[PDB]
């Protein structure tokens, strides 16, 4: 656990020295509170792990991991208006703050281009494309949208699994993929991590939905774990046996 917890904390610290509450407090108060009230996401974590699994420096993926957390954060806020529970801020301030969170993710990335590293520009452009895609209409939004069609004890597992593949999967694959890219890995190893990511997040999403749909056949969590690990073969490093953690 120390490894994963210390990755999450590095990401929190970084977001914290980046998102500083200040006048106009009416704007950064909500930007700060909504960003840290959103559950953390394994897609950010997976970003740093993959980066390190392929040889690169955690610091090479921090902005990407931060950015993925923010994109996830905004979608979460937008998901949870209507007033289901208790909000610190009104529906309008939250809608508008989600709209400000995603852009800040891209700002962080663009501002991280070290100009003494000949290779930054290209890798970062690529990552911006991957993160904007995973978060757009063909990825996550595709999933937030089909979610609407679910009916507690009526809709099938097959359907639920696909909502999980779009809502969470696409974002985990983007995370592992981006870590690979920031780390300088080869196309072959990016593809593998991307796939690994996809399953892991699909599975992670099936759990967030275990708590409602109790129909979840133990065989589905099994086919995913298995598809995940099949993916990590050919690859090695402790993260090659530590990556196989959230499939146990």
């Amino acid at each position: 656990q120390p490894y994963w917890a210390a990755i999450e904390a590095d990401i929190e610290r970084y977001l914290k020295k980046s998102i500083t509450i200040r006048p106009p407090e009416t704007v950064f108060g909500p930007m700060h509170h909504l960003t840290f009230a959103a559950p953390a996401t394994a897609a950010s974590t997976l970003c740093l792990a993959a980066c390190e699994l392929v040889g690169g420096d955690r610091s090479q993926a921090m902005a990407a991991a931060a950015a993925i957390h923010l994109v996830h954060a905004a979608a979460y806020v937008h998901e949870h208006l209507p007033p289901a529970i208790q909000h610190k801020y009104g529906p309008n301030v939250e809608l508008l703050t989600g709209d400000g969170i995603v852009p800040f993710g891209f700002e962080l990335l663009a501002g991280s281009v070290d100009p003494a590293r000949t290779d930054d520009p290209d890798r970062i452009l690529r990552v911006i494309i991957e993160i904007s895609r995973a978060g757009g209409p063909e990825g996550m939004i595709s999933g937030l949208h089909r979610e609407e069609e679910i009916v507690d004890g009526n809709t099938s597992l097959d359907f639920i699994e696909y909502v999980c593949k779009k809502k969470y999967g696409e974002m985990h694959a983007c995370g592992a993929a981006c870590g690979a890219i920031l780390g300088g890995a080869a196309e072959e190893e990016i593809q593998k991590l991307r796939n690994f990511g996809l399953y892991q997040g699909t599975l992670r999403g099936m759990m967030e939905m275990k708590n409602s749909h109790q129909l979840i056949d133990e065989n589905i969590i099994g086919k995913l774990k298995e598809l995940a690990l099949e993916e990590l073969g050919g690859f090695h490093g402790k993260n090659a046996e530590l990556m196989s953690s959230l499939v146990a």
Partner: protein
């Protein structure tokens, strides 16, 4: 003598043709249909024009700025989509038809607008050609800063949190106008100036220009309403506000003197139009 009308028509047609191509129908059909419903509704297309014009002003050409011109239009669309929602202005009509949530449901409208925002970055980053990677990355960063917490959004949030107090100050009002309207005009002009290879001091001059017409627009709107809630006429009177208008207009055009008067014609025509508009 520069035909501004025709000019505006050529650019709009170019932009609409590219927006149409960039945002196509595909699953999920409803998220995509909601995006098109608002994005291709047609408009003056002032922001994509400013982007393209700024790029041709410094010597670059249209095809290089097009994705960024498309991007700023998408962000402007998403801002209107959100503003029309029930938890905001709660409007039933916009730009000639039922609002997006009325036509597709609140949930689809929120998501479609989110889809627009992120696709703006995907599109500028993957489709821009004729520019080096760090240049494209600098631009994505400029787009970011102009739409977020120190831009468009901060303007909207400070506005919404001001609807409580019937009484308001002048520099609170100017803060709303600069972030609400000007920030995205500046972003538009800068993505283009930077994509066309503009030198840093040409960029700076275009930024000033963008802030003035931006501010100028709001100040004129406030004047029209009155000479036909806090506003310029109430804080400093109509005479002084009109004065202020001419001063912003004057400062905008001063910024453009650096450029070929022939390339600047549209931007000068535009500043003068925002200033003497009958409505």
């Amino acid at each position: 003598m520069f035909d501004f009308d025709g000019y505006m028509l050529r650019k709009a047609k170019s932009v609409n043709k590219a927006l149409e191509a960039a945002v196509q129908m595909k699953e999920p059909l409803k998220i995509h249909e909601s995006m098109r419903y608002s994005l291709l509704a047609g408009g003056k297309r002032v922001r994509p024009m400013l982007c393209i014009a700024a790029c041709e002003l410094v010597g670059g050409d249209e095809s290089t700025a097009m994705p960024a011109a498309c991007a700023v239009e998408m962000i402007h669309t998403m801002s209107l989509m959100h503003d029309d929602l029930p938890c905001m202005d709660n409007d039933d009509l916009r730009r000639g038809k039922p609002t997006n949530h009325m036509a597709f449901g609140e949930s689809v409208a929120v998501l479609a607008g989110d889809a627009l925002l992120s696709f703006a970055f995907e599109h500028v980053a993957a489709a821009t050609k004729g520019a080096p990677p760090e240049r494209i990355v600098r631009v994505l960063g400029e787009l970011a800063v102009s739409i977020g917490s120190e831009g468009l959004v901060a303007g909207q949030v400070v506005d919404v949190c001001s609807e409580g107090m019937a009484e308001v100050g002048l520099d609170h009002l100017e803060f709303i106008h600069h972030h609400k309207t000007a920030a995205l005009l500046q972003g538009s002009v800068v993505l283009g100036a930077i994509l066309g290879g503009g030198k840093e001091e040409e960029v700076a001059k275009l930024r000033k220009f963008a802030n003035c017409i931006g501010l100028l627009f709001q100040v004129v709107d406030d004047i029209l309403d009155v000479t036909k809630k806090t506003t310029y006429p109430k804080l400093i009177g109509v005479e002084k506000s009109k004065e202020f208008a001419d001063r912003l207009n004057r400062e905008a055009q001063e910024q453009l003197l650096h450029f070929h008067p022939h390339r600047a014609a549209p931007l000068i025509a535009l500043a003068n139009y925002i200033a003497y508009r009958d409505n």
